[PDB]
Design a protein around this nucleic acid. Structure first.
Length: 96
DNA sequence: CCGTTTCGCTCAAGTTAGTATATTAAAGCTGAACGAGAAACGTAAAATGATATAAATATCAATATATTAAATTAGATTTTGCATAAAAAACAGACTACATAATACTGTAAAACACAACATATGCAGTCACTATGCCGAC
């Protein structure tokens, strides 16, 4: 699974950047995104998708195991709407 | 109310009162002509907002249980900063050998011009005409 380690190694042998700046950019990359989502700002990444923020209202829930109905408290979760460009590059994919 | 004469003013020509600099040396000011990189603009193309509805898929609480990416070490090793020193090649420090200019000295033709008797065209020496109104005389 693609992770920080692999991403840093990529920019290393690709852009020719030191492992220091590379490992730092990968962190600041996702960091800046979270700082925009926590503030309430939308993240529109062209050719990749969008990170929306929808405020859900308290709706009825329960205990999947037993079956005790427990109301799910309202909260602001983050969503991800994959663009049409990325989708087309994942349509004929194959789990590996 | 008006006119006439004195007085406040400025122009014009004498009679006095006051202060004193030139080159070096090195800048400093400012009108005008000279020479690139980065971002705001803009038309055009690509991705996305627009739009809605029954059916399909994701939304998620509360907890047991197998799975796994990956920071956290912890020991292994290429990688990296830094000289040390000798084999090997560069290159002044010598020197005779060799071909080459500045110079030493003899050998010979000829440039460059005074000196002197003639030869004679040409400029200078001496006099009259060419070319056209003065001066003098009348109108």
């Amino acid at each position: 699974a693609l992770t920080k380690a692999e991403m840093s190694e990529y920019l290393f042998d690709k852009l020719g950047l030191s492992k220091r700046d590379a490992k730092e950019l990968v962190e600041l990359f996702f960091e800046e995104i979270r700082r925009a989502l926590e503030n309430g700002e939308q993240v529109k990444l062209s050719g990749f998708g969008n990170f929306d923020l929808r405020d859900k209202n308290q709706r009825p829930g329960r205990n999947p195991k037993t079956g005790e109905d427990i109301p799910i408290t309202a909260r602001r979760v983050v969503t991800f709407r994959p663009g049409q460009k990325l989708k087309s590059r994942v349509e004929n994919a194959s789990p590996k």
